[PDB]
Design a protein around this nucleic acid. Structure first.
Ligand SMILES: Nc1ncnc2c1ncn2[C@@H]1O[C@H](COP(=O)(O)OP(=O)(O)O)[C@@H](O)[C@H]1O
Ligand SMILES: [Mg+2]
Ligand SMILES: [Mg+2]
Lengths: 754, 788
DNA sequence: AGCTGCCAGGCACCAGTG
DNA sequence: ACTGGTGCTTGGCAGCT
C-alpha cells in the first residue's frame, strides 16, 4: 500500500479517508484518533460504510477535524468551519470560521458564517475581552498565526489551524478584501482604519476561498463590532446565566428554551445571536420594542406562513456555491409562494420597521413563476437520475420523453404479443444492465420457447432470451432517455444562471424573513407570557416591579413569587442575607436576565421595569481559588455602569479571612466602582455596612417552619435576616438531637461574642 | 383496527403471536429460513435501533404486517448493537424439519440475550466484570445477589440500610438489575442501566430454596453458609430463575453460592469509593485511578480479580498474612512468571463457554495453549519455598490428558466457527478422514476431466468449474459452443459462455456433496463430543483458572511493590494507624516532581486530628492517602510508605463538603464505631456566619467523645483548632506554608499543632484580587483579631 | 477492482386449472 | 384442492465490465 502512504504525505495534517470497496478506511495514527472520536473498531485500520460517510463526516467536523476524501486522488475535503451541506450542519446552530491574531498594539479577530455570508471583525482591547469574544462566537474552526503569544486563549479549542505569518499581511488583506467586495476602499463598511482586524479577516477569507476553490459571491460585506456597542459578558457569566446552554452542557431549561419559539431555523439562529449580544443603542431597542407591540395581533396568522419559508438562508448559500439540489430549489419556490400572503398580512401593521422588513422581503414573482414551470411538484434528492424538470417547460425534452415512452409502451405490447403467440403464461419482458432488455420464461416452460429466441442468461428457475426486435427498441429507449437526462441537466444548470443575478436581493429577503421570524416570536412570547415593555433612563439604575425569573417561572410547577428591585446611584448595593437555597441566586439571576432581555429589545417578565445603561454584567453566582479569580475579574473590570451579582464570597476559607475579604469587596464595589450590585452573603456582620456607608441597604429572604419541614420563602424584604436555619435543616436531616443541642449552645456563644 | 382474533390470523402469525406473547417487552428475533425477522412494533423498533429497512409482509386479511430482518449468519453483529444499548433480545429458532411439516415448523425460543447474561467474547469487555444482580427490600432491610454468568461466581448479601445498599450497588456495578415490583427506595435504583422490574412471586423464599438446592444438588444450603439468610435467598432465587430463563440449558459452572457478611470486609460508603478514585476517576474515566497504577496484571481474569480486591478489602488476618508472604516470596520471580502467565489468557471466560456448550474452536485452542503452560509454571514455582505459593501451584493442576486430547482433536489454528468444518484435525477419527478423502480428491479429478475433455474435443476454451446455484459444469465459450458434443447436456447459459453437464460429472457432484455433508455432520458430532470429555473436569478446571488469576494478581502486586518502593504493613490489636513516610500512591505517580512523604499517628488516645493549612496545602491528599494505605494493607498488598502499623478497621466513611451534607453526616454519626475511619473534608455549612461551624463543632465532638472513631477532620474553620484544649482524644496538625513577601509557598508536609495563621488573604492575593482590596481586608482582619 | 442483482429459506399470497 | 409463479429483510459474490 505504497499508494496510500505516498498520498497521505500530501495531507499529513488532516485525516484521510481512503476508499476501499464499500468503505473508507483510515490507517495508522489516523485509524487511532478516529476510533477514539467516532468509536468505531480498531483492527492498524478503521473503516466506515460508504452509505454512512456523510453521517461520520458531520461528527468529525463537529469535533474540529478536517477530513480529506480519497476516491485514486484526494477529490474532496471538508473543514469544520467551511461546510455548507445540510447533511453536515446543525439546523439551529451557527457554524463559524474564525481567525485570531495578536499585534503589539492588540488583538485582531474575525468570524465568518460561510452559509449566510455574515462576516465580522473586531479588535478586542485586551486578553479578557478576547476570551469573552472567543466564548461568545465559539468558532468551529480557528486560524491563528505562528507568532502567537497568548496561547492560553486558544490552547484547548477544537479546530485549531496554525498559519504562517505572511497570511496576516495588511496590504494583501486590503487588496483581497477590496477585490472580494468590489470596492476601492473599505470606508463604506466602516473598517478602513481597523488594520489589526483586517489582517485577521484577510487570512480568513483566503482560507475560505482555498477550501472552496470557488467564488463566494454571497460574501459581499463586512461589519465591525465595537466594545461600546454591546453589553459585555465573560465566559463564566455567559455560562452562569444559562442563555443557550445549561450548566450540565444541555440545551433544555435555558433562556433560549423559553424565548425561542421561532418557526424557521434561520430565525432561531438569529435570536440566539441576539441573546448572546445585547445592544446598547436604545435607538435599535426602541424599534425592536415598537415592532413587538405592533405585531401582537398578527402573530397567529403570520407564523404558519413564515414556517413554510424554511431556511432560505442556507439554501441561498448552496445556490451561491452552485451546489443546490432539487429540493433546495423546490423549497425556494415554496418560500416564494408565501411572499404575497406575508405581504398582505403586514400591509396593515402600523410600524415603520415592519413596513421596511416587508419591502426588504421582496416578491420575486418571476423567479417563482420560473420555478413553478421548470421543476416538478416534488423532485428527488439528486438531479443525477433526472426526473426534475417538469413537462411543458421545454419542447425538446417533452419530445425525447415522448419517444422513450413510445418505445417503452411498445416493449410492453411486445410482451403481450409474444404471450398470445407462445401461449406461455410466465413470459414477461424485463430489463437489466448486463443484458439490457430480455424475455423471461420459467424453467418449466422454457423448453417451449420459440426457435428464434436466443438464450443469454440462465437463472435457477428461468431462462432469459433476446431477439433483434427487442434489441431494436432497447436502442430507442436508451438513447432517448440518455438525451432527456442530458437535457434536464442542462436546463438545471440554466436555472442557476437565471437565479444568481438576484442573489443580493434574495439574501436581503432571507435576512428580512429571519428578522421577522425573531420579532414575530418575541411579540408572541411577550403577549403569551405576560411581559412588559421596559423603559430606558439616562443614568444607571434598575427599578423592577414584580419581576420574575423568565425560565424558573415556566418550569417549576409551584407558584413563582415575584419580587421588586430598586437600584439607583443612591441605592447601589443590596446586602442580601437569609437562606440561599436557590432563592437568593434566583433573585440575582433574574435581575441579570431582565437586564439582558431589556437590552435585546424584548419585553420582560415584570409589571414594570425602568433600566439605565449597562456596559457589562457580572455574575459570580452559584474552589475558593476559582471563586476568588472570578471576583478579581470583577473588581478589576467593573465600572459604575456595570451590573454585579455576587453570591456569598468568603465561603471556603476561615471565618475572619472570608469576612475580611467580603467586607473589602463590598466596600470597594460600593465606594470605588459604584457598580449596581447585589451582594449575597451569609455573614451577618456585613449587615452593619449600611450604617457605615451611603448607597448600601439590607434585604433578605426568610423561611417558614411548619408541620414536619421548612418552607424556604422566595420573597425579598427590607432589612437583615434575623434567623439562621442550618440547625433546623440538620434536625430535619436526622442529626441526633443531642448534637443539635450542643450546636445550638455553641452557636449562641459564637454569635454573642459579636 | 381489524379485529385480530386467533382464527383471523395465518398459521404463521398464530405461532408468532403465541411466542411473542411469552416475550411481550423484548425484541423477538424470529427464525424464518435464512433470516431472523421481527414484526409489528418489534420491526419498527429494530429498524431504528439497527438501522435496517422497515418493510412489510402482505396479508390476505387487510392490515399489512410491519416487517424487518437480518440474515442468520450476521446475527452476532446486530446483537452487539442491541445489548450495548441495554436491549434484551429473545432468539427463536426452527426446531423441526419443514420437509415433514404440514404447516409452520415448530419454533422455540432457545436463548434470551440480555446485558447481564452475555458470555460471548465479542459482547464483553476483557478487563471488566459484567454482573447480573437482583435486589429485594423489606420492612427490615435489603436482599442482594450477584452472579457472573461467565465465571459462575454467585454471591448473596443483606445490606443493613439504604446507604449500605447504595454502596453495594456502586461496588458491584451490575449491568442488569432485577428488582421486585414492590421496591420502595426507587432512588437507589432509578437511573441504573439494564433495570428489570419483576413480579413479586419471583422472590418467594420457598421457591428460592427449592431452586437453589436443585441447582446445587443439595438438600439444604447449610453447607454454603446461606441457609440463614432468607432475605438474600429471595434475591438469589429471582436471579437464578432469570439466568436459567435466559440460557435455557444447564448451568454446571454455577455450583455454589457464598454469603458476603459485613464483618468480613471493610465497608466503604459510596463517597469513599468515589473520593478515593479506586477504579474510576471523579470525571468518570479510568485514567489516574488506583487501578491505573496498581493494575499491571497480565491476564484479563487477573485484572478483574484485582479490581474486585481493591473494592472489597478483607478483614481476615490469616488471608492477609498469606497474601503478603506470597508477594514477598515471588518478588524475585516476577520477570520469569509474567510472560508465561500471560499466555494462559482468559481461561475463566472460556471455561464458562465450555460449561454453556458455546465454546468456539479458538476457545478450545486457547485452552490448549493454556494447558501447555502449566508445566513451565509448575517448574518455575517449585523452588519458591512458601506454603501459600505451593498451595497455588497445586491448585492450578496439570490436565495432561486434556492437553493431549485437544492436541489430537483440533488443528493448530482452527477457524472462528465450527459451522463450516475444518476444525477437527486428521487422524483423530478414521471415518471422518475417509469422508474428507472424496472432499480432497477435487484436486486431481476435476483438473483431469478438464484436460481429458479439452483434448478429446479440441475446444481450447473448455474449462471445468463449480457453481453453487447450478452445480459442477463444463464450460465452453460462446464461439466454440456450437461445436460441443451432442452428448453434453446444457445446464447454464451465460453472455459469452455455455455450461454443460455429463453423467460422469453429475455422478461426481452427487457424491462430492453427499460426502461433504457426511464430513461436516460427523465433524460436528466429534466437536460436541469434546464437550462431553471436557465437562467432567469443569470443577478442577475452574479451580485452576481461579488459582492462575490469583497468581497473576499476587505476582503483579509483588512487581509493583518492588518497582514503586512499597513496604509490608503489620497489623496491631487495637484501632490505630501509624505511618512513617507515607505517600499518595496515585498522586506521586501522576506528578512530575517530588511527592512529599508524611507521617501519621492515630490511636485510641490520639483518635481525632483537626487538620488545617491553606487551600491547596495538601489537606485532602493527606486524608486520601491515609484511606488508600489502609485499603491496600487490607487487600494483602504492600504499601506506599517506609513503615506502616495498622489496627482493625470496620468501615471507612467520607464526607466531602445542604440536606445532603447533613443527611450523610447524620448517617456517619449513626453508624460509625471505635473501629471506623472517618474522613470529614471541610464540612459545616449554614445560612449564617456560625451556623455551619457550630454543627461541625458539635459533630466533631460527638465523633471524639461518643463514637470515638479514628477521624481525620480537615477544616477551614480556625475556631476548630481550639478543640484539642477542650476535648480528650483530639489533636491539631497542619500542612505547613511559608510566606515570603507577596506569595505563599506550599510545603505539603504535616506538622503538629495548629498553623500560626490561616491564609485566606494570601490565597486570595494569589488569585489576583486587587491589592487595594487585600490591603483593606488585612485592615479589617486586624480589627477582628483584636476581639480576643 | 467497481456495480448490479441473484440467491439464501422460511411462509403467505394469487391467478389458473381441478 | 393443487401448480407454479410472486414478495421480503441483508450479506456474499457471480458475472460482467
Ligand atoms: N504531599 C504532597 N506532595 C506533593 N504534592 C502534593 C502533596 N499533597 C498535595 N499535593 C499537591 O497539591 C494539590 C492540592 O492538594 P489538596 O489535598 O487538594 O489541598 P487542600 O485539600 O488543602 O485544598 C494536589 O492536587 C497535589 O497536586
Ligand atoms: Mg412444510
Ligand atoms: Mg481539599
Amino acid at each position: 500500500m505504497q499508494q496510500y502512504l505516498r498520498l497521505k504525505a500530501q495531507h499529513p495534517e488532516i485525516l484521510l479517508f481512503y476508499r476501499m470497496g464499500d468503505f473508507y478506511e483510515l490507517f495508522y495514527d489516523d485509524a487511532k484518533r478516529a476510533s477514539q472520536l467516532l468509536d468505531i473498531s480498531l483492527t492498524p485500520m478503521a473503516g466506515i460504510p460508504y452509505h454512512a460517510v456523510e453521517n461520520y463526516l458531520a461528527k468529525l467536523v463537529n469535533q474540529g477535524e478536517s477530513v480529506a476524501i480519497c476516491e485514486r486522488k484526494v477529490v474532496r475535503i471538508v473543514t469544520p468551519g467551511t461546510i455548507s451541506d445540510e447533511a453536515l450542519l446543525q439546523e439551529r446552530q451557527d457554524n463559524l470560521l474564525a481567525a485570531i491574531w495578536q499585534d503589539s498594539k492588540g488583538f485582531g479577530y474575525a468570524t465568518l458564517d460561510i452559509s449566510s455570508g455574515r462576516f465580522r471583525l473586531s479588535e478586542p482591547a485586551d486578553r479578557e475581552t478576547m476570551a469573552a469574544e472567543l466564548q461568545r462566537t465559539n468558532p468551529a474552526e480557528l486560524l491563528y498565526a505562528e507568532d502567537f503569544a497568548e496561547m492560553s486563549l486558544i490552547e484547548g479549542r477544537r479546530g485549531l489551524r496554525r498559519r504562517p505569518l505572511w497570511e496576516f499581511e495588511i496590504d494583501t488583506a486590503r487588496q483581497q478584501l477590496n477585490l472580494q467586495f468590489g470596492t476601492r476602499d473599505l470606508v463604506g463598511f466602516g473598517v478602513e482604519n481597523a488594520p489589526r482586524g483586517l489582517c485577521a479577516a484577510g487570512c480568513l477569507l483566503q482560507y475560505a476561498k482555498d477550501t472552496q476553490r470557488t467564488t463566494l459571491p454571497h460574501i459581499r460585506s463586512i461589519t465591525m463590532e465595537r466594545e461600546q456597542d454591546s453589553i459585555i459578558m465573560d465566559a463564566a457569566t455567559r455560562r452562569n446565566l444559562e442563555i443557550t446552554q445549561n450548566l450540565a452542557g444541555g440545551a433544555e431549561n435555558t433562556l433560549a428554551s423559553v424565548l425561542d419559539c421561532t418557526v424557521t431555523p434561520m430565525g432561531s439562529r438569529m435570536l440566539k445571536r441576539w441573546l448572546h449580544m445585547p445592544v446598547r443603542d436604545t435607538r435599535v431597542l426602541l424599534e425592536r420594542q415598537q415592532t413587538i407591540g405592533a405585531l401582537q395581533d398578527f402573530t397567529a396568522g403570520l407564523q404558519p406562513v413564515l414556517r413554510q419559508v424554511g431556511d432560505l438562508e442556507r439554501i441561498l448559500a448552496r445556490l451561491a456555491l452552485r451546489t443546490a439540489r432539487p429540493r433546495d430549489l423546490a423549497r425556494m419556490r415554496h418560500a416564494f409562494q408565501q411572499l404575497p400572503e406575508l405581504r398582505a398580512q403586514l400591509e396593515t401593521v402600523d410600524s415603520a420597521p415592519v413596513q421596511a422588513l416587508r419591502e426588504k422581503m421582496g416578491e420575486f414573482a418571476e423567479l417563482r413563476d420560473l420555478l413553478e414551470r421548470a421543476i416538478i411538484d416534488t423532485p428527488p434528492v439528486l438531479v443525477r437520475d433526472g426526473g426534475v424538470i417538469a413537462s411543458g417547460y421545454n419542447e425538446e425534452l417533452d419530445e425525447w420523453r415522448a419517444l422513450a415512452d413510445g418505445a417503452t409502451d411498445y416493449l410492453e405490447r411486445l410482451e403481450v404479443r409474444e404471450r398470445e403467440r407462445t401461449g406461455l403464461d410466465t413470459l414477461k419482458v424485463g430489463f437489466n444492465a448486463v443484458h439490457g432488455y430480455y424475455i423471461q420464461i420459467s424453467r418449466g416452460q422454457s423448453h417451449l420457447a420459440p426457435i428464434n429466441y436466443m438464450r443469454r442468461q440462465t437463472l435457477k428457475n428461468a431462462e432469459r432470451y433476446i431477439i433483434p426486435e427487442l434489441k431494436e427498441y432497447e436502442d430507442k429507449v436508451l438513447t432517448s432517455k440518455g438525451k432527456a437526462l442530458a437535457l434536464e441537466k442542462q436546463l438545471y444548470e440554466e436555472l442557476f444562471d437565471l437565479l444568481l443575478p438576484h442573489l443580493e436581493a434574495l439574501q436581503q429577503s432571507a435576512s428580512a424573513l429571519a428578522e421577522l421570524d425573531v420579532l414575530v416570536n418575541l411579540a408572541e412570547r411577550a403577549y403569551t407570557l405576560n411581559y412588559t415593555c421596559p423603559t430606558f433612563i439616562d443614568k444607571p439604575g434598575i427599578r423592577i416591579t414584580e419581576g420574575r425569573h423568565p425560565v424558573v417561572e415556566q418550569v417549576l410547577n409551584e407558584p413563582f413569587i415575584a419580587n421588586p428591585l430598586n437600584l439607583s446611584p443612591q441605592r447601589r448595593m443590596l446586602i442580601i442575607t437569609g437562606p440561599n437555597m436557590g432563592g437568593k441566586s434566583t433573585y440575582m439571576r433574574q435581575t441579570a436576565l431582565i437586564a439582558l432581555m431589556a437590552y435585546i429589545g424584548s419585553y420582560v417578565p415584570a409589571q414594570k421595569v425602568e433600566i439605565g445603561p449597562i456596559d457589562r454584567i457580572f455574575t459570580r453566582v452559584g474552589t475558593f481559588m476559582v471563586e476568588m479569580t472570578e471576583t478579581a475579574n470583577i473588581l478589576h473590570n467593573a465600572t459604575e455602569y456595570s451590573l454585579v451579582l455576587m453570591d456569598e464570597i468568603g465561603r471556603g476559607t476561615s471565618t475572619y479571612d472570608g469576612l475580611s475579604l467580603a467586607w473589602a469587596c463590598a466596600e470597594n464595589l460600593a465606594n470605588k466602582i459604584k457598580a449596581l450590585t447585589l451582594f449575597a452573603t451569609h455573614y451577618f456582620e456585613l449587615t452593619q455596612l449600611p450604617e457605615k456607608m451611603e448607597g448600601v441597604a439590607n434585604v433578605h429572604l426568610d423561611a417558614l417552619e411548619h408541620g414536619d419541614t421548612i418552607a424556604f420563602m422566595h420573597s425579598v424584604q427590607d432589612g437583615a435576616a434575623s434567623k439562621s436555619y442550618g440547625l433546623a435543616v440538620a434536625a430535619l436531616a436526622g442529626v441526633p438531637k443531642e448534637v443539635i443541642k450542643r450546636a445550638r449552645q455553641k452557636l449562641r456563644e459564637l454569635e454573642s461574642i459579636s
